[PDB]
């Protein structure tokens, strides 16, 4: 699918697409226009993704998706540059599975024929412990590889249970380059390579994976007959991002009636705690796990207060939280749910930051609890903002924190609603940004 590369960037991305997998009415198909046949095997599963559903692959022979490149499409051939892109979600590997499977390199996406004795020519995406590997292999047997070594801090890592957007460009005259979320993260020279004769199938499946429990998710798998440049990559990545659905920490759609641990984006090493029922919330340091021998550490998740989002007007609709929804926020404490809000004339700081209260119950005192869940900033981050309203549709502010002291308690970062944030919404970091972290099988603390 050739192009004049002086074209507008959107046009470049659209017409250089040789292959593009989409899921519609639970059927994986090629929407590129070249109509390559896609075969979904029984145990290829579908999970929530970045837009609609995603492919979910588990470790057995029936969990696979195969693309028969339609008759004849060529994108590698001989010295033809190409790019592959996909959203990827890999569970955080436990310390257990690391030191017993660290050395097991297994492919997840590949155009190489797999024989019992050898592999043969093509390209492959593979995982080896906390490494993401891109391999090119020519018909004469020469190989070039990028080995992306993921960072040790798994709260901020790319192969640790969040949806991330992968793009790998191949300039046969220079290098292969690996981008994650539009940022260059690895590279290798590939100049020596000869002809790449790949299979006529692209196979999405865990191949040679010794861990029975391993799985991955993949979405928007896409192939371009060009080596994309950084501007095109940046446009491609942001073309997938939208505010319509709010996101949990993993990148999945936010949901009503679901327990979430709250973490402030600006103080990611902190948890939210409750002083007491009917009183205020504040931040504390979260505990952490460190294993130098295995090259990993992280603040532990699922400590601190659990929150639940409910529809403000039950309205019967699905369970997805959309940006702009009116919600009620509850804390789950001692097997009960307690409303979050601000009492009329309740305690507040001198700057009018309103101190939030949990389960406040004074009879005859109005409790302002109407919130709007919104995405006002930082589209690339899976964070949400919450706007609190009084009884007259006036803004009491975004939920955030205020460093202060109440009574003789220690000095604390106390949860508040503040209108200050609205003059500051383009700032780099703000305390009105929250992660909503649900428990997930892809992250267990060691």
């Amino acid at each position: 699918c050739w192009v004049d590369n002086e074209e507008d960037i959107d046009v470049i991305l659209k017409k250089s697409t040789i292959l593009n997998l989409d899921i519609n009415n639970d059927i994986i198909s090629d929407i590129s226009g070249f109509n390559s046949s896609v075969i979904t095997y029984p145990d290829a599963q579908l999970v929530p993704g970045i837009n609609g559903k995603a492919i979910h692959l588990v470790n057995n022979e029936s969990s696979e998706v195969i693309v028969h490149k339609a008759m004849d499409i060529e994108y590698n051939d001989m010295f033809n540059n190409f790019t592959v892109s996909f959203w990827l979600r890999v569970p955080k590997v436990s310390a257990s599975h690391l030191e017993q499977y660290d050395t097991n390199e297994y492919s997840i996406i590949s155009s190489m024929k797999k024989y019992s004795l050898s592999i043969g020519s093509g390209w492959s995406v593979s995982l080896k412990g906390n490494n993401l590997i891109w391999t090119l292999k020519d018909s004469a047997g020469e190989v070039r590889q990028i080995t992306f070594r993921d960072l040790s801090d798994k709260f901020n890592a790319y192969l640790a249970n969040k949806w991330v957007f992968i793009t790998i460009t191949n300039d046969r005259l220079s290098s292969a380059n690996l981008y994650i979320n539009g940022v260059l993260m690895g590279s290798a020279e590939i100049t020596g390579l000869g002809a790449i004769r790949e299979d006529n199938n692209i196979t999405l499946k865990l191949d040679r994976c010794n861990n029975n429990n391993q799985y991955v998710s993949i979405d928007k798998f896409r192939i371009f007959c060009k080596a994309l440049n950084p501007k095109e990559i940046e446009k491609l990545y942001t073309s997938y991002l939208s505010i319509t659905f709010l996101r949990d920490f993993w990148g999945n759609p936010l949901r009503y009636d679901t327990e979430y641990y709250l973490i402030p984006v600006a103080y990611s090493s902190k948890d939210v705690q409750l002083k007491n029922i009917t009183d205020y919330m504040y931040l504390t340091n979260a505990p952490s796990y460190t294993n130098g021998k295995l090259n990993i550490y992280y603040r532990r998740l699922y400590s601190g207060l659990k929150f639940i989002i409910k529809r403000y007007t039950p309205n019967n609709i699905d369970s997805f939280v959309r940006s702009g929804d009116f919600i009620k926020l509850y804390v789950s404490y001692n097997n009960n749910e307690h409303i979050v809000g601000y009492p009329k004339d309740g305690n507040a700081f001198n700057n009018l930051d309103r101190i939030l209260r949990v389960g406040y119950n004074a009879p005859g005192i109005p409790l302002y609890k109407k919130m709007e869940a919104v995405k006002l900033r930082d589209l690339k981050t899976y964070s949400v903002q919450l706007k609190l309203y009084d009884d007259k549709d006036a803004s009491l502010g975004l939920v955030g924190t205020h460093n202060g002291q109440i009574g003789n308690d220690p000095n604390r970062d106390i949860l508040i609603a503040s209108n200050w944030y609205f003059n500051h919404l383009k700032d780099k970091t703000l305390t009105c940004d929250w992660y909503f972290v649900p428990t997930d099988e892809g992250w267990t603390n060691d």
Partner: antibody
Amino acid sequence: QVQLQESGPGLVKPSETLSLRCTVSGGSISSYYWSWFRQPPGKGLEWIGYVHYSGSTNYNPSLKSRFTLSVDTSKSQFSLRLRSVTAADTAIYYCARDKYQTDVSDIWGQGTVVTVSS
Amino acid sequence: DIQMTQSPGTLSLSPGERATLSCRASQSITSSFLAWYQQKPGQAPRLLIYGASSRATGIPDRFSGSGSGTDFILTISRLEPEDFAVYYCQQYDTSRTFGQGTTVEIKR
């Protein structure tokens, strides 16, 4: 006992670029928001913009992106740049520290007089 | 874009008298992000009131702020000699803008 001291050229010719600095003493840039204001002779106060150690800035929209604020934490300074100055830019320029989690300013410098003329 | 109109333009009073300064915004400031500054000749402004009614640190108790919506008031309960100056209101709800100032001068 935090003190702010503006410094700049007293006089600037029209169409040049004006550069001003504020030096913080008895304290540091830290995580405060830092603002510039100006007051033309006999004419009252105007907010120009803020700057923050993260590099975040914001401006009075009616000043049409003629100003650029910047900061250097290593020198405990922040600065203002104003392009293509006109006689209407003659004023006293003030630097100030914004109050924590407010957009009011509670610590001010003495101001620096800027005259733009040929 | 919010404009503020202060009245009166000039206030002529004696020490010991009550001073009421008014500020009217072109739109409702539902946040109550309205502040008051004092400026004497040749000096930088001085924050008096913020959040419409909170006194800044170190400000004497004779200064109080009140009001809501579009109408805000600075009161000086009993003028002292050092209080004759210009007073500016500032909204910091949508960007930051000032009124044109009210002068408090000595009546004779």
